[PDB]
PDB file of C-alpha atoms and ligand atoms in Angstrom:
ATOM      1  CA  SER W   1     -53.698 109.242  24.967  1.00 57.94           C
ATOM      2  CA  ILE W   2     -53.473 111.950  27.666  1.00 58.69           C
ATOM      3  CA  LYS W   3     -50.663 109.900  29.229  1.00 59.91           C
ATOM      4  CA  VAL W   4     -48.587 109.817  25.928  1.00 60.18           C
ATOM      5  CA  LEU W   5     -49.190 113.620  24.957  1.00 61.24           C
ATOM      6  CA  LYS W   6     -47.978 114.153  28.819  1.00 66.20           C
ATOM      7  CA  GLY W   7     -44.837 112.144  28.521  1.00 67.45           C
ATOM      8  CA  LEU W   8     -43.712 113.597  24.957  1.00 65.99           C
ATOM      9  CA  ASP W   9     -44.317 117.108  26.932  1.00 63.98           C
ATOM     10  CA  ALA W  10     -42.061 115.783  29.803  1.00 64.10           C
ATOM     11  CA  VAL W  11     -39.181 115.312  27.226  1.00 61.28           C
ATOM     12  CA  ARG W  12     -39.860 118.699  25.291  1.00 60.96           C
ATOM     13  CA  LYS W  13     -39.973 120.589  28.700  1.00 61.38           C
ATOM     14  CA  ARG W  14     -36.419 119.213  29.511  1.00 61.65           C
ATOM     15  CA  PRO W  15     -34.586 118.017  26.340  1.00 60.36           C
ATOM     16  CA  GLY W  16     -30.970 118.304  27.512  1.00 60.04           C
ATOM     17  CA  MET W  17     -31.841 115.843  30.459  1.00 56.54           C
ATOM     18  CA  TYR W  18     -33.232 113.278  28.106  1.00 54.41           C
ATOM     19  CA  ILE W  19     -30.917 113.785  24.918  1.00 57.02           C
ATOM     20  CA  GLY W  20     -28.165 116.048  25.833  1.00 57.37           C
ATOM     21  CA  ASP W  21     -26.957 119.713  25.245  1.00 55.37           C
ATOM     22  CA  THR W  22     -29.497 121.119  22.781  1.00 54.12           C
ATOM     23  CA  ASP W  23     -27.111 124.098  21.702  1.00 55.41           C
ATOM     24  CA  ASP W  24     -23.828 122.827  21.226  1.00 53.58           C
ATOM     25  CA  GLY W  25     -24.693 119.900  18.920  1.00 52.06           C
ATOM     26  CA  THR W  26     -24.285 116.914  21.395  1.00 50.15           C
ATOM     27  CA  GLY W  27     -27.965 116.594  21.809  1.00 49.41           C
ATOM     28  CA  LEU W  28     -28.662 116.884  18.026  1.00 45.84           C
ATOM     29  CA  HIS W  29     -26.112 114.230  17.062  1.00 45.05           C
ATOM     30  CA  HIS W  30     -27.254 111.955  20.074  1.00 40.61           C
ATOM     31  CA  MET W  31     -30.728 111.865  18.334  1.00 40.77           C
ATOM     32  CA  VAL W  32     -29.124 109.870  15.235  1.00 40.77           C
ATOM     33  CA  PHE W  33     -27.311 107.910  17.931  1.00 42.60           C
ATOM     34  CA  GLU W  34     -30.490 106.903  19.741  1.00 39.14           C
ATOM     35  CA  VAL W  35     -32.181 105.544  16.378  1.00 38.56           C
ATOM     36  CA  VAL W  36     -28.911 103.770  15.250  1.00 39.25           C
ATOM     37  CA  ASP W  37     -28.714 102.093  18.677  1.00 41.70           C
ATOM     38  CA  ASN W  38     -32.150 100.497  18.105  1.00 38.15           C
ATOM     39  CA  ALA W  39     -30.793  99.047  14.984  1.00 39.97           C
ATOM     40  CA  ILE W  40     -27.743  97.747  16.620  1.00 37.26           C
ATOM     41  CA  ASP W  41     -30.006  96.372  19.185  1.00 37.07           C
ATOM     42  CA  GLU W  42     -31.736  94.420  16.338  1.00 39.36           C
ATOM     43  CA  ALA W  43     -28.294  93.315  15.175  1.00 37.11           C
ATOM     44  CA  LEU W  44     -27.112  92.087  18.515  1.00 37.91           C
ATOM     45  CA  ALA W  45     -30.431  89.910  18.785  1.00 35.91           C
ATOM     46  CA  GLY W  46     -29.208  88.122  15.379  1.00 35.74           C
ATOM     47  CA  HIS W  47     -31.709  89.715  12.907  1.00 35.07           C
ATOM     48  CA  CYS W  48     -30.224  93.007  11.543  1.00 33.75           C
ATOM     49  CA  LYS W  49     -27.146  92.435   9.045  1.00 32.65           C
ATOM     50  CA  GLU W  50     -27.180  96.057   7.335  1.00 34.04           C
ATOM     51  CA  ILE W  51     -27.891  99.575   8.655  1.00 33.02           C
ATOM     52  CA  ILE W  52     -28.096 102.593   6.021  1.00 32.26           C
ATOM     53  CA  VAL W  53     -27.777 106.080   7.688  1.00 32.08           C
ATOM     54  CA  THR W  54     -28.674 108.847   5.435  1.00 33.57           C
ATOM     55  CA  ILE W  55     -28.027 112.583   5.770  1.00 28.82           C
ATOM     56  CA  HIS W  56     -30.747 114.091   3.681  1.00 27.56           C
ATOM     57  CA  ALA W  57     -30.354 117.212   1.805  1.00 29.85           C
ATOM     58  CA  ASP W  58     -32.788 119.064   3.984  1.00 26.68           C
ATOM     59  CA  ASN W  59     -30.791 118.003   7.407  1.00 25.94           C
ATOM     60  CA  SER W  60     -33.000 115.233   8.418  1.00 26.14           C
ATOM     61  CA  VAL W  61     -31.541 111.949   9.150  1.00 22.77           C
ATOM     62  CA  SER W  62     -32.886 108.302   8.076  1.00 26.06           C
ATOM     63  CA  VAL W  63     -31.680 104.903   9.569  1.00 27.78           C
ATOM     64  CA  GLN W  64     -32.838 101.878   7.771  1.00 26.47           C
ATOM     65  CA  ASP W  65     -32.305  98.337   9.023  1.00 24.90           C
ATOM     66  CA  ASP W  66     -33.121  95.021   7.626  1.00 22.83           C
ATOM     67  CA  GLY W  67     -34.058  93.549  10.979  1.00 18.81           C
ATOM     68  CA  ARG W  68     -37.630  92.116  11.723  1.00 20.12           C
ATOM     69  CA  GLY W  69     -39.474  95.269  11.841  1.00 21.48           C
ATOM     70  CA  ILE W  70     -41.284  96.933  14.661  1.00 20.77           C
ATOM     71  CA  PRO W  71     -44.265  94.731  15.386  1.00 17.15           C
ATOM     72  CA  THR W  72     -47.498  96.445  13.740  1.00 18.20           C
ATOM     73  CA  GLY W  73     -50.487  94.527  15.395  1.00 17.56           C
ATOM     74  CA  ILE W  74     -52.657  96.397  17.484  1.00 19.36           C
ATOM     75  CA  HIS W  75     -51.680  96.521  21.213  1.00 18.45           C
ATOM     76  CA  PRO W  76     -54.904  95.699  23.099  1.00 21.90           C
ATOM     77  CA  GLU W  77     -54.588  98.272  26.134  1.00 24.22           C
ATOM     78  CA  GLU W  78     -54.036 101.301  23.922  1.00 26.09           C
ATOM     79  CA  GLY W  79     -55.942 100.252  20.789  1.00 26.40           C
ATOM     80  CA  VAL W  80     -53.134 101.322  18.463  1.00 29.94           C
ATOM     81  CA  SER W  81     -50.264  99.447  16.630  1.00 33.03           C
ATOM     82  CA  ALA W  82     -47.559  98.188  18.774  1.00 32.59           C
ATOM     83  CA  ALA W  83     -45.244 100.315  16.734  1.00 32.86           C
ATOM     84  CA  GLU W  84     -47.142 103.577  17.551  1.00 32.59           C
ATOM     85  CA  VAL W  85     -46.803 102.513  21.350  1.00 34.85           C
ATOM     86  CA  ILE W  86     -43.128 102.151  20.996  1.00 33.58           C
ATOM     87  CA  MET W  87     -42.690 105.470  19.148  1.00 35.30           C
ATOM     88  CA  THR W  88     -44.875 107.601  21.686  1.00 38.39           C
ATOM     89  CA  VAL W  89     -44.416 105.857  25.278  1.00 38.25           C
ATOM     90  CA  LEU W  90     -41.149 106.610  27.398  1.00 39.34           C
ATOM     91  CA  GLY W  91     -30.739 103.959  25.671  1.00 39.03           C
ATOM     92  CA  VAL W  92     -33.440 106.676  26.116  1.00 38.62           C
ATOM     93  CA  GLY W  93     -35.849 105.186  23.683  1.00 36.22           C
ATOM     94  CA  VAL W  94     -36.791 106.308  20.208  1.00 36.26           C
ATOM     95  CA  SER W  95     -39.678 107.892  21.680  1.00 35.67           C
ATOM     96  CA  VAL W  96     -37.539 110.752  22.773  1.00 36.13           C
ATOM     97  CA  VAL W  97     -36.207 111.160  19.259  1.00 34.72           C
ATOM     98  CA  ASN W  98     -39.855 111.453  18.263  1.00 33.96           C
ATOM     99  CA  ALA W  99     -40.969 114.009  20.989  1.00 31.55           C
ATOM    100  CA  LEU W 100     -38.066 116.223  19.801  1.00 29.34           C
ATOM    101  CA  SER W 101     -38.616 115.689  16.006  1.00 30.59           C
ATOM    102  CA  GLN W 102     -40.906 118.504  14.165  1.00 28.65           C
ATOM    103  CA  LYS W 103     -41.452 115.565  11.945  1.00 29.64           C
ATOM    104  CA  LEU W 104     -40.782 111.831  11.815  1.00 30.67           C
ATOM    105  CA  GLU W 105     -41.525 109.124   9.297  1.00 26.24           C
ATOM    106  CA  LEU W 106     -41.493 105.578  10.167  1.00 27.32           C
ATOM    107  CA  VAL W 107     -41.764 102.729   7.564  1.00 27.37           C
ATOM    108  CA  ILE W 108     -41.812  99.007   8.588  1.00 29.81           C
ATOM    109  CA  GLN W 109     -41.460  96.038   6.285  1.00 27.56           C
ATOM    110  CA  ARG W 110     -42.872  92.902   8.314  1.00 27.54           C
ATOM    111  CA  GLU W 111     -45.150  89.992   7.479  1.00 28.39           C
ATOM    112  CA  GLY W 112     -45.291  90.690   3.637  1.00 27.59           C
ATOM    113  CA  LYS W 113     -46.504  94.165   4.099  1.00 28.39           C
ATOM    114  CA  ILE W 114     -45.187  97.739   4.276  1.00 27.81           C
ATOM    115  CA  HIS W 115     -46.383 100.147   6.882  1.00 25.49           C
ATOM    116  CA  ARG W 116     -46.010 103.691   7.288  1.00 23.16           C
ATOM    117  CA  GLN W 117     -46.830 106.479   9.658  1.00 24.74           C
ATOM    118  CA  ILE W 118     -45.940 110.321  10.246  1.00 26.54           C
ATOM    119  CA  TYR W 119     -45.495 112.086  13.183  1.00 25.83           C
ATOM    120  CA  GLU W 120     -45.149 115.670  14.229  1.00 25.96           C
ATOM    121  CA  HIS W 121     -43.658 116.693  17.757  1.00 27.00           C
ATOM    122  CA  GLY W 122     -44.592 112.982  18.535  1.00 28.71           C
ATOM    123  CA  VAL W 123     -48.229 113.083  17.392  1.00 30.46           C
ATOM    124  CA  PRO W 124     -49.188 110.664  15.111  1.00 31.09           C
ATOM    125  CA  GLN W 125     -51.113 112.161  12.015  1.00 29.87           C
ATOM    126  CA  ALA W 126     -53.076 108.917  11.243  1.00 30.97           C
ATOM    127  CA  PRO W 127     -52.960 104.922  12.303  1.00 34.08           C
ATOM    128  CA  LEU W 128     -49.969 103.000  10.923  1.00 34.45           C
ATOM    129  CA  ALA W 129     -51.141 102.037   7.520  1.00 34.73           C
ATOM    130  CA  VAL W 130     -50.341  99.412   4.793  1.00 33.03           C
ATOM    131  CA  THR W 131     -48.956 100.858   1.592  1.00 36.82           C
ATOM    132  CA  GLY W 132     -47.912  97.828  -0.124  1.00 37.58           C
ATOM    133  CA  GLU W 133     -46.255  94.295  -0.178  1.00 36.76           C
ATOM    134  CA  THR W 134     -42.846  93.265   0.325  1.00 39.35           C
ATOM    135  CA  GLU W 135     -40.617  90.179   0.791  1.00 38.79           C
ATOM    136  CA  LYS W 136     -38.061  92.289   2.734  1.00 35.85           C
ATOM    137  CA  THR W 137     -38.133  92.945   6.504  1.00 36.41           C
ATOM    138  CA  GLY W 138     -36.916  96.006   8.373  1.00 38.98           C
ATOM    139  CA  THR W 139     -37.477  99.500  10.095  1.00 39.85           C
ATOM    140  CA  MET W 140     -36.654 102.896   8.748  1.00 36.72           C
ATOM    141  CA  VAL W 141     -37.012 105.986  10.808  1.00 34.34           C
ATOM    142  CA  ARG W 142     -36.446 109.474   9.247  1.00 33.21           C
ATOM    143  CA  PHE W 143     -36.622 112.514  11.435  1.00 34.10           C
ATOM    144  CA  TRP W 144     -36.281 116.446  11.377  1.00 33.60           C
ATOM    145  CA  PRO W 145     -35.144 117.705  14.667  1.00 36.22           C
ATOM    146  CA  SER W 146     -37.259 120.432  16.050  1.00 35.03           C
ATOM    147  CA  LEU W 147     -35.857 123.905  15.745  1.00 34.57           C
ATOM    148  CA  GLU W 148     -37.868 124.778  19.065  1.00 31.92           C
ATOM    149  CA  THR W 149     -35.531 122.445  20.787  1.00 33.62           C
ATOM    150  CA  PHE W 150     -32.208 122.431  18.874  1.00 34.63           C
ATOM    151  CA  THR W 151     -30.460 125.802  18.865  1.00 34.97           C
ATOM    152  CA  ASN W 152     -27.029 127.300  17.149  1.00 37.83           C
ATOM    153  CA  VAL W 153     -25.924 123.663  15.949  1.00 37.79           C
ATOM    154  CA  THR W 154     -28.723 122.872  13.707  1.00 40.67           C
ATOM    155  CA  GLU W 155     -26.805 120.967  10.579  1.00 39.03           C
ATOM    156  CA  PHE W 156     -25.463 117.440  10.986  1.00 39.89           C
ATOM    157  CA  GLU W 157     -21.850 117.001  11.103  1.00 39.94           C
ATOM    158  CA  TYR W 158     -20.968 114.047   8.933  1.00 35.69           C
ATOM    159  CA  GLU W 159     -17.608 113.461  10.574  1.00 35.87           C
ATOM    160  CA  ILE W 160     -19.461 113.030  14.152  1.00 37.16           C
ATOM    161  CA  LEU W 161     -21.792 110.444  12.560  1.00 34.94           C
ATOM    162  CA  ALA W 162     -18.863 108.715  10.768  1.00 36.32           C
ATOM    163  CA  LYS W 163     -16.665 108.410  13.891  1.00 38.01           C
ATOM    164  CA  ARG W 164     -19.439 106.760  15.785  1.00 37.64           C
ATOM    165  CA  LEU W 165     -20.592 104.365  13.063  1.00 37.96           C
ATOM    166  CA  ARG W 166     -17.115 103.326  12.674  1.00 39.01           C
ATOM    167  CA  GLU W 167     -16.957 102.511  16.274  1.00 38.53           C
ATOM    168  CA  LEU W 168     -20.107 100.568  16.099  1.00 40.92           C
ATOM    169  CA  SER W 169     -19.114  98.625  13.120  1.00 41.46           C
ATOM    170  CA  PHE W 170     -15.881  97.593  14.835  1.00 39.25           C
ATOM    171  CA  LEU W 171     -17.647  96.534  18.104  1.00 37.59           C
ATOM    172  CA  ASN W 172     -20.549  94.753  16.029  1.00 34.90           C
ATOM    173  CA  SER W 173     -18.149  93.055  13.211  1.00 35.76           C
ATOM    174  CA  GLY W 174     -20.974  91.086  11.314  1.00 30.65           C
ATOM    175  CA  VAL W 175     -22.907  94.496  10.782  1.00 28.43           C
ATOM    176  CA  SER W 176     -22.384  96.344   7.583  1.00 26.03           C
ATOM    177  CA  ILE W 177     -23.025  99.949   8.187  1.00 25.62           C
ATOM    178  CA  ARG W 178     -23.453 102.537   5.461  1.00 27.63           C
ATOM    179  CA  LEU W 179     -23.454 106.485   5.858  1.00 27.53           C
ATOM    180  CA  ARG W 180     -24.683 108.475   2.996  1.00 27.60           C
ATOM    181  CA  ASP W 181     -24.475 112.411   2.837  1.00 32.71           C
ATOM    182  CA  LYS W 182     -27.384 113.503   0.313  1.00 30.67           C
ATOM    183  CA  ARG W 183     -25.979 117.104   0.745  1.00 31.09           C
ATOM    184  CA  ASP W 184     -22.927 116.470  -1.036  1.00 31.04           C
ATOM    185  CA  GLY W 185     -22.576 112.823  -2.399  1.00 31.74           C
ATOM    186  CA  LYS W 186     -20.064 111.710   0.422  1.00 31.47           C
ATOM    187  CA  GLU W 187     -20.380 108.015   1.315  1.00 34.50           C
ATOM    188  CA  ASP W 188     -18.957 105.545   3.664  1.00 33.92           C
ATOM    189  CA  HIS W 189     -19.071 101.742   4.087  1.00 35.50           C
ATOM    190  CA  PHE W 190     -18.084 100.429   7.644  1.00 32.85           C
ATOM    191  CA  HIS W 191     -18.065  96.551   7.524  1.00 33.31           C
ATOM    192  CA  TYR W 192     -15.117  94.796   9.910  1.00 35.39           C
TER     193      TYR W 192
HETATM  194  C1  LIG R   1     -34.199 101.645  13.494  1.00 35.86           C
HETATM  195  C2  LIG R   1     -34.896 101.065  14.308  1.00 35.86           C
HETATM  196  N1  LIG R   1     -35.187  99.731  14.455  1.00 35.86           N
HETATM  197  C3  LIG R   1     -35.878  99.392  15.524  1.00 35.86           C
HETATM  198  C4  LIG R   1     -36.168  97.788  15.501  1.00 35.86           C
HETATM  199  O1  LIG R   1     -35.851  97.006  14.651  1.00 35.86           O
HETATM  200  N2  LIG R   1     -36.886  97.447  16.783  1.00 35.86           N
HETATM  201  C5  LIG R   1     -37.464  96.201  17.106  1.00 35.86           C
HETATM  202  N3  LIG R   1     -38.155  95.978  17.875  1.00 35.86           N
HETATM  203  C6  LIG R   1     -38.785  94.792  17.918  1.00 35.86           C
HETATM  204  C7  LIG R   1     -39.610  94.109  19.188  1.00 35.86           C
HETATM  205  C8  LIG R   1     -40.083  92.952  18.888  1.00 35.86           C
HETATM  206  O2  LIG R   1     -40.900  92.480  19.880  1.00 35.86           O
HETATM  207  C9  LIG R   1     -40.011  92.496  17.501  1.00 35.86           C
HETATM  208  C10 LIG R   1     -40.737  90.929  17.212  1.00 35.86           C
HETATM  209  O3  LIG R   1     -41.155  90.451  18.292  1.00 35.86           O
HETATM  210  O4  LIG R   1     -40.403  90.401  16.270  1.00 35.86           O
HETATM  211  C11 LIG R   1     -39.352  92.912  16.589  1.00 35.86           C
HETATM  212  C12 LIG R   1     -38.672  94.045  16.756  1.00 35.86           C
HETATM  213  S1  LIG R   1     -37.560  95.120  15.804  1.00 35.86           S
HETATM  214  C13 LIG R   1     -36.174 100.336  16.096  1.00 35.86           C
HETATM  215 CL1  LIG R   1     -37.106 100.574  17.517  1.00 35.86          CL
HETATM  216  C14 LIG R   1     -35.722 101.469  15.580  1.00 35.86           C
HETATM  217 CL2  LIG R   1     -35.719 103.121  15.931  1.00 35.86          CL
END
């Protein structure tokens, strides 16, 4: 717990070092790319077939995959869900995105259950919890970048995300990638 909080603090103290320039939009868009890269890893492993990337009307971004779902069982050493360990302990890792997010929402569908957890600046608000039943599997991460970290360029650029997602669809030809902008209704579907 003290180690977790110190590691998150290490990322916040030197955020450009972990995520890229925090003033010119590079780091901001790399936050999305890190989350997408985890979904792509789940596609490379043979589990994920579709990835949905949403720019919400409030300039948060979500990434949904249909992979296995991050494991949810208690990780013995930490006494918290494996998912929480992945989200909070230091491809820079999704924990960097969590550390640099004012808020992050995690929803996992796995082993017949839906699980949800909220973080603020990487601090879990409650233990991962069951919210219902599902026959689906996958992982959804929605994050609200911290305005204490990201300056000047704070709004996501549809075209920057679209170009990278098109590249990833070409390089992962089986994967379907959807991009949706809730700010204006724009959407794209990349599937080689
Ligand atoms: C959008 C997004 N998706 C992910 C993701 O699917 N990561 C996952 N990691 C693991 C690790 C595992 O050991 C297992 C298992 O053994 O079944 C399953 C998964 S799924 C992450 Cl992380 C993020 Cl971020």
